[PDB]
Write a protein that binds this ligand. Structure first.
Ligand SMILES: Nc1ncnc2c1ncn2[C@@H]1O[C@H](COP(=O)(O)OP(=O)(O)O)[C@@H](O)[C@H]1O
Ligand SMILES: Nc1ncnc2c1ncn2[C@@H]1O[C@H](COP(=O)(O)OP(=O)(O)O)[C@@H](O)[C@H]1O
Ligand code: VO4
Ligand code: VO4
Ligand SMILES: [Mg+2]
Ligand SMILES: [Mg+2]
Ligand SMILES: [Mg+2]
Ligand SMILES: [Mg+2]
Ligand SMILES: [Mg+2]
Ligand SMILES: [Mg+2]
Ligand SMILES: [Mg+2]
Ligand SMILES: [Mg+2]
Ligand SMILES: [Mg+2]
Ligand SMILES: [Mg+2]
Ligand SMILES: [Mg+2]
Ligand SMILES: [Zn+2]
Lengths: 48, 552, 230
RNA sequence: GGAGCUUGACUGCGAGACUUACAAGUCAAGCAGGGACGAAAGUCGGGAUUAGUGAUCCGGCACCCCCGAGUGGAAGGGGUG
RNA sequence: UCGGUACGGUUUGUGUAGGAUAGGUGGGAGACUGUGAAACCUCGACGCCAGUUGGGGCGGAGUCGUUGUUGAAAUACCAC
């Protein structure tokens, strides 16, 4: 019900993050503005 | 010599499996039909095969030298023009190139000298490679087969269930190879579907048609692909092969549970018994039991909530009355000289081909669209409940418990106090399905919260606006036997020749012809006895040749 | 189906693969049977015309011509019209000739048009495209050198192109030429087919080839013959 | 308790300590990169605190392109998540 | 006997415009030597959009058939 999800980047697709969300409250993929060390600057992140 | 295949693909939404260990293949020219109950994953299969949805755990894979087309169950027809919406795909591979011919139209010598040959020269060949040189001479030949609206009609709101005549004219003009389509016989007539049973019957290419009616699938498909709880099964037959094969699978699996629960009684009282003197309770029969009580939980489960319509207040001697009505639009006058009184304790069926004005007749009765001439006498002995074709009461951003219950906890339905969560559970949405949004739902679950929020006032005159669509043969009977035991006067618009043959007493037909496209005919009698009247009130058994979508 | 046609078919065995040394002789058994006229050479390719990298469309300059009037339509003014009428073109016009194309008069074979007279040509080519009378720079018609290209159409730079059903269709001229004058035209086309093998031709490239006349039967040739036609 | 924007429920580290047979567990000011909020001062490396977890082995995946069994590659191995 | 494959013979494709196009493409100015005319035989399988060509009775008594024709193209006959 809370699966582990992972936040790939949106410029370069590195799978930089991993966390949990509630699958029935949020049936769509999370978008957050997290850091990316490949790029060295904040970018967007969707799920996989 | 294959056109689509899957490896060991498994796909799930929630803890509700849609596929698990599904390996199957598809030949070119395989008239595949897809069946199954509502919510069983007919389109979640078909989204992946179109390439939009990725599987979870497996490999979905199209063949290389081929192409795909898709008709979703609500085609997202963008709103520019109808003659737009036949070349912006279909000939959409050519419009991206025929904007360059307009640039090089009058052929000046300015700014290009060696592109006088090579850049313009590919346009000389791609106007003869695909043999799409004119693009607007056989485009009229295409739209004179779907019987489309005229070319200068901007689809801002004016198309009802004739959106789908345009979207069929898109991807059948693409001429694809993998031809995927969710429910073509939705919203169509008994002359456009009867056309589509020949264009898909002399068609090079591979077809997977997801459908629910018994009679489209008998003439189109040649194999069946069902979808049970996760598991697929290919067949060889018709739709009646599926209903006998589904009945025996649920029976002989039901007989397993009527054996496994029996030997679960003795393996429980044996565990409940105390141990004797020196002996030991054998620890390989507690592992035998505590494992066996896990195949007594996940195996047996089912649910099917019957549709029931609430009962409203007492209906008087008048229901609604319409005398010499005139209504159309600017030049397009679709109702002339119609007079009828709507009966008491019956079922009224509205029969007419598409684009004639069946939905607008209920706009006048509910009162969202005032007529031109005539009079609509209503009476104060009637309270209105109106389910609609557009399903606009459903908001695609909020979930099932707010789409119908408006966020609060006890709703008024029959002027009574029935709780919200217990009311939506009467339509199948229970437990985990109270938290899911409204675009996520199926086409059946879309057409069942439609009845949840519009049969909420619970009046005594209900207007069914295409209820026979997007739902299987098990909930269709739950609506066929919920308005035969209704106190009075449900009115239904339907194209389904075997839904009005069983529940109808009052035909509201349309015998319009060339000199006036506005004649309507009132009748008292069931649909099956109306037809022998029409063979002798109109011409002698005259109430066709195919229209080729392209000559090449 | 004719009584004289089956006797021509009796003189060619179906089973035995033939050579250009022999197909010239079997042309003579058909030139003494039928009209000595254009001889068709068909090639079934091992390609797929769906893709762009497997789309085969080539050219060949034959060493003996083609046995045809080779009429050239020239749209030119000034000295470009004078330099093309002295090269073999019998149809020499301008933008005024565009009005005579749509009047039911298409009595020409090729249309080598100058870029300067391209005012109303791209719209009248729509009745030329599927009728095959359309110009093309890859055919050598829409080009800045409209002088030497007229004698090349006289010289037989006829263009072949694989259709949708994976078939090459190209000619080797009249039977009025000699027997080895056939193989000079015959070997030149296949030498341009093999150069136009695509980058991704899976399997064997030239799977079948045949030769036939106007109203005569076909001739099974050997695809292994690629170097020593004569 | 309420409201407005937001993603620090970060990446590279971490002096010094608590607890501790070992393995573990815990706290951490402060430094930089790149942010959020604030007029600034500053606070933010999840939640008022303390539970919501499981060593090693062997495997899966994504990326870094480290070794490549004569050499060029590859198979396989390895590294950071 | 029922199948897979490779070669070869015959055959099917019917909106709207005219003889409802015998499909695609290249070639094409002619074709058959025969009543193309009719019958108990009607491409009795095609069969509806139907006259597309024969289970073929005429039995050298000999016409049809490029038809330049409005259409996107039409016509023989043959080849891929
Ligand atoms: N994105 C989603 N998230 C969660 N559940 C979904 C989603 N899409 C569909 N479902 C549920 O899973 C089932 C699959 O839908 P499906 O049956 O494939 O639609 P259709 O009836 O058109 O085939 C539906 O009953 C629906 O309730
Ligand atoms: N908003 C509108 N404005 C003008 N005309 C409309 C509008 N909505 C529908 N129509 C016309 O109504 C006619 C058919 O009514 P419709 O509701 O589509 O009947 P049905 O529901 O039986 O198909 C169509 O000709 C359409 O042009
Ligand atoms: O838009 V309808 O013809 O299904 O009433
Ligand atoms: O495939 V459906 O259950 O949306 O008719
Ligand atoms: Mg939320
Ligand atoms: Mg409608
Ligand atoms: Mg569906
Ligand atoms: Mg975390
Ligand atoms: Mg430290
Ligand atoms: Mg900082
Ligand atoms: Mg600021
Ligand atoms: Mg800190
Ligand atoms: Mg071990
Ligand atoms: Mg090595
Ligand atoms: Mg490796
Ligand atoms: Zn990045």
């Amino acid at each position: 019900v809370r699966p582990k999800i992972t936040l790939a980047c949106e410029v370069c697709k590195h799978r930089n993050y991993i966390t949990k969300k509630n699958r029935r409250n949020d049936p769509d993929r999370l978008e957050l503005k997290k850091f990316c060390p490949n790029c060295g600057k904040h970018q967007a992140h969707r799920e996989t | 010599e294959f056109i689509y295949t899957m490896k060991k693909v498994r796909k799930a939404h929630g803890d509700k499996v849609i596929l698990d260990d599904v390996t199957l293949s598809f030949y070119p020219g395989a008239k595949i039909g897809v069946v199954g109950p509502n919510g069983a994953g007919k389109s979640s299969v078909l989204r992946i095969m179109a390439g939009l949805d990725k599987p979870n755990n497996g490999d979905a894979f199209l063949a290389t030298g081929a192409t795909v087309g898709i008709l979703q169950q609500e085609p997202p027809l963008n709103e520019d023009k109808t003659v737009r919406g036949n070349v912006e795909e279909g000939m959409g591979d050519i419009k991206i190139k025929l904007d360059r011919f307009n640039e090089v139209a009058e052929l000046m010598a300015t700014d290009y000298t060696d592109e006088l040959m090579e850049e313009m020269g590919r346009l000389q060949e791609e106007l003869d490679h695909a043999d799409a040189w004119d693009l607007d001479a056989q485009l009229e030949q295409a739209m004179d087969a779907l019987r489309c609206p005229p070319a200068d009609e901007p689809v801002t709101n004016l198309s009802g269930g004739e959106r789908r005549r345009v979207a069929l004219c898109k991807l059948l003009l693409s001429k694809p190879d993998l031809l995927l389509l969710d429910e073509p016989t939705n919203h169509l007539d008994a002359e456009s579907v009867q056309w589509l049973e020949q264009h898909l019957a002399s068609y090079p290419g591979a077809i997977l048609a997801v459908t629910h009616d018994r009679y489209f699938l008998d003439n189109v498909a040649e194999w069946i692909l069902e979808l049970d709880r996760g598991r697929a099964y290919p067949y060889e037959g018709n739709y009646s092969t599926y209903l006998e094969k589904k009945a025996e699978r649920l029976a002989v699996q039901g007989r397993k549970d009527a054996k496994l629960q029996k030997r679960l009684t003795e393996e429980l009282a044996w565990v409940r018994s105390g141990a004797k003197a020196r002996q030991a309770k054998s620890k390989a029969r507690l592992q035998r039991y505590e494992e066996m009580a896990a195949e007594a939980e996940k195996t047996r489960k089912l649910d099917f909530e019957e549709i029931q319509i609430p009962v409203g207040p007492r209906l008087g001697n008048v229901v609604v009355e319409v005398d010499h009505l005139d209504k159309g639009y600017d030049g397009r006058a679709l109702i002339k000289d119609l007079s009828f009184s709507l009966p008491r304790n019956g079922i009224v069926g509205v029969i007419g081909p598409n684009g004639v004005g069946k939905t607008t007749l209920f706009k006048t009765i509910v009162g969202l669209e005032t007529p031109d001439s005539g009079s609509v006498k209503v009476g104060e002995t009637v309270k209105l409940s109106y389910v609609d074709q557009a399903r606009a009461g459903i908001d695609p951003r909020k979930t099932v418990w707010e789409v119908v219950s408006d966020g609060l906890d006890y709703i008024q339905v029959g002027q009574t106090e029935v709780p919200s969560r217990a009311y939506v559970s009467a339509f199948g949405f229970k437990g985990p399905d109270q938290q899911k949004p409204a675009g996520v739902l199926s086409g059946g679950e879309r057409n069942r919260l439609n009845l949840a929020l519009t049969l909420k006032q619970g009046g005594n005159l209900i207007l069914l606006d295409e209820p026979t669509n997007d739902l299987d043969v098990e909930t269709l009977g739950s609506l066929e036997n919920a308005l035969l035991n209704f106190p009075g006067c449900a009115v239904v618009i339907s194209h389904d020749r075997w839904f009005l043959d069983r529940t109808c007493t009052h035909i509201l037909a349309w015998e319009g012809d060339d000199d006036n496209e506005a004649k309507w005919f009132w009748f008292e009698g069931n649909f099956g006895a109306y037809e022998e009247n029409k063979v002798e009130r109109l011409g002698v058994d005259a109430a066709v040749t195919h229209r080729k979508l392209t000559r090449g | 189906t004719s009584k004289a046609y089956r006797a021509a078919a009796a003189k060619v065995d179906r089973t035995n693969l033939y050579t250009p040394l022999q197909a010239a002789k079997l042309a003579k058994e058909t030139s003494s049977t039928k009209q000595d006229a254009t001889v068709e050479v068909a090639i079934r390719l091992g390609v797929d015309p769906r893709k762009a990298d497997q789309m085969v469309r080539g050219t060949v300059n034959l060493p003996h011509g083609t046995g045809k009037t080779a009429r050239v339509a020239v749209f030119a003014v000034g000295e470009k019209a004078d330099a093309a009428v002295a090269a073999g073109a019998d149809v020499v016009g301008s933008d005024d000739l565009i009005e005579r194309i749509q009047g039911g008069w298409l009595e020409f074979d090729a249309a080598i048009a100058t870029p300067d007279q391209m005012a109303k040509v791209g719209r009248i080519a729509r009745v030329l495209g599927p009728r095959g009378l359309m110009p093309n720079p890859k055919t050598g018609t829409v080009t800045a050198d409209v002088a030497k290209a007229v004698a090349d159409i006289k010289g037989g730079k006829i263009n072949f192109r694989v259709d949708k059903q994976a078939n090459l269709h190209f000619v080797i001229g009249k039977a009025s030429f000699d027997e080895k004058l056939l193989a000079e035209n015959y070997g030149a086309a296949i030498d341009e087919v093999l150069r136009l093998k695509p980058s991704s031709s899976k399997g064997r490239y030239l799977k079948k080839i045949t030769v036939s006349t106007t109203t005569g039967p076909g001739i099974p040739v050997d695809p292994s013959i690629t170097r020593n036609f004569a």
